């Protein structure tokens, strides 16, 4: 029994697990809970450092860099190691404190001249797309070479945090265009999380995987085709979510429990005892 | 020491899709809070089989003693316990009547599913839990489930003309679909409401009648608030993201 006790290694693994499952906009509250439950800041700092970084990269946390207008997404595609991240729109690296969500020490970062135009053209089309289609969305576009394939990876984030009204929500989408001329394979995942917690805890978790193709040509024309594909899939996803809500409402939910007995009146609790 | 407060706060934020797993993880994290967490953290109801009477009954912390659970039909523990916690003889008679009454309530409102009621003696009255579980039929490729947990506390007076009732009610509602249009969609969790009032207790208005009205009023209310929160508010929030 004592040989089967929960080790400190297992406690901080659990601590770290809870932290990576914090709802959008509630990292600080889940962290503070876990910090007080574990009651060992040194163990927390050591065993949960990877989880702080994993949360922000998983969540596409947008960060403002002093001196630059556009925010940048914290993603795995930008992880340069040593606590630094790539801003591929401003061609800079920066240090990121995963706890305070603060960027610092921006430095120029080397960038292959090859994909400059293609990444710049997709970034420019996506930025206009995101400003048109989201209330306060942000996007980041990486241009890399994975194996031999020159790849464009587009990430979009959009959140609304209203903790005084006990709800938060976030949309994330991640689009990959693997270039294999005259076409490109398009793979994408769209994610939504919504959390409502006034006298309760209700959460929507949704994701959709996308597989498409597209003919590629010039950098500017292919970026237009890319964004058209994104717009079509994301509009379609959002419409179907709302139709699915309606179906859940008037089919499944109605079938689980009636509003009233068939008498169209509440129960006579003296006749029930009979 | 705010560890229990932090633990309950945590359960309000971690995805309710994993309630069972996170409660066990949480107890691994702070074993000293086990008994407090088992009594204050609602979990999806499980069904067990009373082989003696051939009826289903519902499992929660209130009818648990160690690793056994008490059936509301036979009043016996499974696995068998030699001296498991049981209601007093008089309270047990009220418990049998309550189970029959809420079995009828279940059929009237849910037209299916399973109910269980467990009562226990208090110093100046009694308390009880009313449990209902109903799974959806799977229509239109939607999985649906409903769990009711109604916990009532009854404070009786020496005069026996009036009693104080406090009701704390939780409904857990779970829905999920996997479709080509909307991809995977899991909408789940729970809402909790509380109220209390003094009611006349008389021969024409006995305890079970008073409790049944409180439960029916509360559940009709929570049903409408689930409709509003699940299919109105969270949908509105989704559409405000894009």
């Amino acid at each position: 029994d004592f040989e089967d006790r929960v080790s400190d290694e297992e406690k901080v693994r659990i601590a770290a697990k809870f932290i990576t499952h914090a709802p959008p906009g509630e990292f600080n509250e889940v962290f503070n809970d876990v910090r007080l439950l574990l009651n060992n800041d040194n163990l927390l700092r050591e065993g949960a450092a990877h989880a702080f970084a994993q949360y922000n990269m998983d969540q596409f946390t947008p960060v403002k860099i002093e001196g630059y207008d556009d925010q940048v997404l914290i993603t795995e595609h930008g992880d340069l190691g040593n606590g630094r991240f790539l801003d591929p729109r401003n061609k800079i690296s920066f240090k990121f404190d995963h706890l305070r969500k603060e960027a610092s020490d921006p430095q120029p970062e080397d960038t292959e001249s090859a994909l400059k135009q293609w990444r710049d053209a997709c970034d420019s089309a996506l930025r206009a797309y995101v400003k048109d289609h989201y209330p306060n969305g942000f996007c980041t576009v990486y241009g890399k070479s994975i194996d031999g394939q020159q790849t464009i990876i587009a990430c979009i984030e959009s959140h609304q945090f209203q903790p005084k009204n006990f709800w938060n929500g976030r949309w994330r989408s991640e689009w990959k265009f693997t270039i294999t001329p005259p076409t490109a394979q398009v793979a994408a995942v769209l994610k939504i999380q919504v959390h409502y917690y006034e006298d309760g805890n209700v959460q929507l978790v949704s994701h959709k995987d996308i597989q498409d193709s597209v003919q590629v040509s010039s950098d500017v024309q292919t970026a237009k085709e890319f964004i058209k594909i994104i717009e079509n899939a994301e509009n379609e996803y959002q419409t179907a979510i709302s139709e699915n809500y309606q179906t859940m409402s008037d089919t499944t939910f109605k079938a689980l429990r009636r509003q009233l007995p068939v008498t169209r009146t509440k129960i006579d609790w003296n006749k029930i005892l009979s | 020491d705010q560890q229990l407060d932090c633990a309950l706060d945590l359960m309000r934020r971690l995805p309710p899709q994993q309630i069972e797993k996170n409660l066990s993880d949480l107890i691994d994290l702070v074993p000293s809070l086990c008994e407090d967490l088992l009594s204050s953290v609602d979990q999806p109801l499980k069904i067990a089989r009373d082989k003696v009477v051939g009826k289903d009954y519902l499992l929660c912390d209130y009818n648990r003693d160690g690793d056994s659970y008490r059936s509301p039909w036979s009043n016996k523990y499974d696995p068998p316990l030699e001296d498991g916690a049981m209601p007093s003889a008089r309270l047990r008679k009220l418990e049998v009547e309550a189970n029959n009454a809420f079995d009828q309530y279940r059929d009237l409102y849910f037209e299916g599913g399973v109910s269980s009621v467990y009562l226990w003696d208090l110093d100046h009255g009694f308390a009880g839990v009313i449990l209902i579980k109903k799974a959806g039929d799977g229509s239109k490729k939607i999985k649906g489930c409903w769990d009711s947990i109604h916990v009532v506390e009854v404070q009786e007076k020496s005069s026996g003309r009036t009693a104080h009732y406090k009701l704390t009610s939780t409904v857990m509602l779970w829905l999920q679909t996997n479709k080509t249009g909307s991809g995977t969609m899991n909408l789940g969790g729970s809402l909790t409401r509380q109220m209390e009032k003094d009611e006349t207790v008389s021969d024409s208005s006995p305890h079970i009648a008073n409790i049944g009205r409180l439960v029916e009023d509360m559940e009709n209310k929570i049903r409408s608030t689930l409709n509003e929160i699940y299919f109105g508010k969270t949908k509105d929030i989704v559409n405000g993201l894009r």
């Binding site: 006298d199 | 706060d9 009594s39 209601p87 916990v151």
Partner: peptide, 12 residues
């Protein structure tokens, strides 16, 4: 956050 289930009666 306010925890309503923490003001319930304790079990048997």
């Amino acid at each position: 956050l306010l925890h309503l289930t923490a003001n319930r009666p304790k079990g048997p």
